[PDB]
Amino acid sequence: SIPWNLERITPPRYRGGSLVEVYLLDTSIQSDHREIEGRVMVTDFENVPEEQASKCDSHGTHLAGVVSGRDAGVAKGASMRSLRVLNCQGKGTVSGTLIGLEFIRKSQLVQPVGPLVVLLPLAGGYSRVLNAACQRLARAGVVLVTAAGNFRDDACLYSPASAPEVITVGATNAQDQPVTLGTLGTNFGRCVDLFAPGEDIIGASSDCSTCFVSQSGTSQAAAHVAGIAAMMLSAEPELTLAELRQRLIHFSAKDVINEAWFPEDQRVLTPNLVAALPPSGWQLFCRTVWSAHSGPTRMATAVARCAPDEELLSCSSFSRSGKRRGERMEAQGGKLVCRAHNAFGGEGVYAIARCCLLPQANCSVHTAPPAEASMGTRVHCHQQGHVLTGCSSHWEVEDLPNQCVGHREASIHASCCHAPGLECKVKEHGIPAPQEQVTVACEEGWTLTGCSALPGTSHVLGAYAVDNTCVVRSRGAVTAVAICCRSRH
Amino acid sequence: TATFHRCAKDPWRLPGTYVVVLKEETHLSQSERTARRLQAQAARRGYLTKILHVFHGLLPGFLVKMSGDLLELALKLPHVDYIEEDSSVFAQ
């Protein structure tokens, strides 16, 4: 009797979000439906293009039910306010959505409440102004959850999906696989943060006040995360956007999606995560941030940045062709970023950042230039009490304990932090004949902070952290090297 | 120097309406005078315009119904950061 999707987001151990309000920008809704009656308030804001109450109310009514519905909701009896920005055929405009977002911000200024989650179950093409408006509203301290989009495409090409400071949600089904929708289906890619149940989702039907219908889509999926976020914020009202995103990632089910469904290039870029509520001491959260592809230009660099309240603990790079000049950790505005260099004749590279929540942290980078005509380039965290959390390396040519080692022709960069509460170890795995990739994983209860390939003459395409596993990609032998840390209390 | 943008998905474009986005610092009062200045300059050139909405709260600027002929002119208005042609969004 428990709907598959509500069971699916239930953690392995488990016992609303009442001080949180959720805003919904969608179609009009049947507010007196028994699932939501009394808990959803219609603002009567409307801004919709020109084109039956039940048909018109269908999409928004269902979504309101998914978030907060009395029987089939995620955050049963959480408060919602709804704005109408989609018409009866489910169509809206960017300007309309802009005005709705502005309306939410004005209301908050006029009458402040607690944490606000804004659900945007809609998508259009990439929009500079819509993305800026979402970024702005997020920097004002609001949480935005949006649909990845249903075009079986890279979500970075749509908005608000592609806006970096919103949480973008793809749809998976009861088999934990990406949802197909006609000839299309859930979007994917590095602009998608995680997936959630988005097929055969039962919820309020606007056909009648007690009726129910089953719907599919990344809107439904986004509704699940909006409700999960409402619950997380109710329990921990002080969470920042970065802290909330790291928890969503951490409490998600890992690696249950079969990546073969995605096109080849998008498999590394797409988080294999299906959302779940927390099971409900301090511990170390890290996440992997992929940059936009740098592009083919000769002096092209890709940059991966952490949130302001995160630390960058390591930096790797990847290229499909393998034509790359590595990566470096550098400071911008006084925050370290991850910067990768394309090979002059290459198609481009990704920079890949490992971003962690480490408050009691003073970190820094140590760099040594190429040693040349030596064994190799070395550098290490020299002072006592400091731990190495990542190694990086970048070179200028086209041909070639607490310590990082690099090729004799490359510069070497170590990330060093003073964090006494922290313990780290290095685990290595080498494969003589790499079939395609070599991986090594941190032990259960440890967090991967750093992932790299042991230097040599291997034609490695690069390396990246996938959750707590270090992956090195190859075209002697190839060795994956993971740096793992955990708190000690 | 201000730039112009429209949806790369052609069928999703809504020409004839534009979002004029002003520089971050721009104050509501300046936004309103910029919009009045556009209508006036537009009028001297024979063009009807309609200011559908002035933004304050997240993003300074305004929504204007006008011919695209006026975009070069609008891009030279004071305080303009960029202008984006409106486009469609769809329930997912």
Tell me the CA distances in angstroms from A284 to A194, A361, A446, A465, A470, one per residue in order. 20, 12, 8, 15, 17
Q: E strands of A106-260, at which residues?
A: 116-120, 122-125, 143-147, 158-159, 167-172, 180-181, 184-185, 194-197, 201-204, 212-215, 253-254
| DSSP code, position A214 | E
Q: Which CATH architecture is the domain A282-489 placed in?
A: Sandwich (2.60)
Residues near A406 by beta carbon (within 8 Å), at least 6 away in sequence: A376, A377, A378, A391, A393, A412, A455
Helical segments of A69-180, H only: 94-110, 128-139
CA dihedral A36, A29, A8, A355 (to 10 degrees): -110
A184 contact B CB<8A: no
Question: Looking at chain A, which residue has its C-alpha nearest residue B10?
Answer: A125
CB A153 within 8 A of CB B92: no
Chain A hits for B87, Cβ within 8 Å: 93-94, 124-125, 127
Cβ-Cβ pairs closer than 8 A, A with B, add up to 108
Sign of CA dihedral A160, A163, A167, A172: positive
Domain A1-281 homologous superfamily, CATH: Peptidase S8/S53 domain (3.40.50.200)
Taking the CB of residue A15, how many other CB atoms lie within 10 A of it?
4
The answer to whether the Cβ–Cβ distance between A102 and B58 falls below 8 Å is yes
CA distance A145 to A235: 18
In Å, the largest CA–CA distance within chain B is 44
SS3 B71: helix
Q: Number of C-alpha atoms within 13 angstroms, CB side, residue A183?
A: 0
CA distance A29 to A84: 8
CA distance A79 to A75: 9
Place of tokens 């006592």: A384
Question: Looking at chain B, which residue has its C-alpha nearest residue A85?
Answer: B89
Q: Number of C-alpha atoms within 13 angstroms, CB side, residue A28?
A: 16
Sign of CA dihedral A81, A84, A85, A86: positive
Which one of A97, A98, A217 has the shortest CB-CB distance to B92?
A: A217
Joined together, the tokens standing for residue B58 give 């997240």
In Å, the largest CA–CA distance within chain A is 80
Helical segments of A295-362, H only: none
Question: Looking at chain A, which residue has its C-alpha nearest residue B57?
Answer: A102
Identify which of A467, A257, A206, A187 has the alpha carbon closest to the alpha carbon of residue A354. A467
Burial of A407 per CB tally in 10 Å (0-12, 13-18, 19+): buried
CA distance A270 to A189: 5
Chain A hits for B52, Cβ within 8 Å: 95
The β-bridge partners of A117 are A22, A143
Which one of A91, A105, A217 has the shortest CB-CB distance to B57?
A: A105
Joined together, the tokens standing for residue A181 give 């929708």
SS3 A105: helix
Joined together, the tokens standing for residue A105 give 């911000």
Q: Where are the domains of chain A?
A: 1-281, 282-489
CA distance A125 to A130: 10
Q: Does domain B1-88 have CATH number 3.30.70.80?
A: yes
